[PDB]
Amino acid sequence: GALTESQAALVKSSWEEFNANIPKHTHRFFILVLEIAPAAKDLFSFLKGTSEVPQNNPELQAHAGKVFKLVYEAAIQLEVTGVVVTDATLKNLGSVHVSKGVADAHFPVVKEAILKTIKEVVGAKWSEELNSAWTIAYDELAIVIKKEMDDAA
Numbered sequence: 001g002a003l004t005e006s007q008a009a010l011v012k013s014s015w016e017e018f019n020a021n022i023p024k025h026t027h028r029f030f031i032l033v034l035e036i037a038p039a040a041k042d043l044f045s046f047l048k049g050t051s052e053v054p055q056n057n058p059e060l061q062a063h064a065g066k067v068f069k070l071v072y073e074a075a076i077q078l079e080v081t082g083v084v085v086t087d088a089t090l091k092n093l094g095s096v097h098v099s100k101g102v103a104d105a106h107f108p109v110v111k112e113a114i115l116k117t118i119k120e121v122v123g124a125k126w127s128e129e130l131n132s133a134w135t136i137a138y139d140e141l142a143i144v145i146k147k148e149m150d151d152a153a
């Protein structure tokens with residue numbers, strides 16, 4: 001709906017805070033994914049076969065860091081331009097996700113795990129506005145990735 005300039009500023013603030021402790025917060029993110037949907041474990045190469053979510057895995061860390069940064073960058077582009085631009089990068093993400101057996105109905109899983117991660121990251125700074133902002137950003141980004149999935153047969 002929104003992303004006013006103060007909504008964008010909040011996504012940016014919260015993303016910085018997230019990024020201040022990548023080892024902690026990415027690990028936390030993957031724990032929350034599996035609590036929502038244990039079956040999702042099998043899609044991720046760095047998880048498959050583990051007992052617990054690894055705490056010092058650079059593949060896990062770079063993957064989840066990239067996820068959060070793309071949603072934040074989507075937030076700023078919606079706020080500045082009024083859209084999410086479909087580029088070659090998101091086109092490539094559409095093909096990638098179809099290849100790894102990701103489907104439209106998986107996207108709400110990663111959404112809730114992002115909202116809960118950010119909630120834990122900001123602590124007492126959490127607000128309704130913050131939550132709405134990451135929700136819009138995620139949804140608009142997901143629309144474009146799903147279109148390219150649908151498109152990337």
Ligand code: HEM
Pocket residue numbers: 040043044045046066067070071093096097100102103106107108109110138141142145
């Ligand atoms: C807005 C939502 C999403 C974003 C921004 C996103 C971002 C990405 C990125 C950046 C990559 C890595 C591309 C590369 O470096 O090759 C990737 C890979 C992947 N994603 Fe997503 N993702 C999203 C949603 C999902 C969902 C809903 C699922 C399924 C639960 C999922 C599962 C996967 C898997 C299995 C991989 C491959 C990684 C591997 O081979 O271990 N993603 N995603």
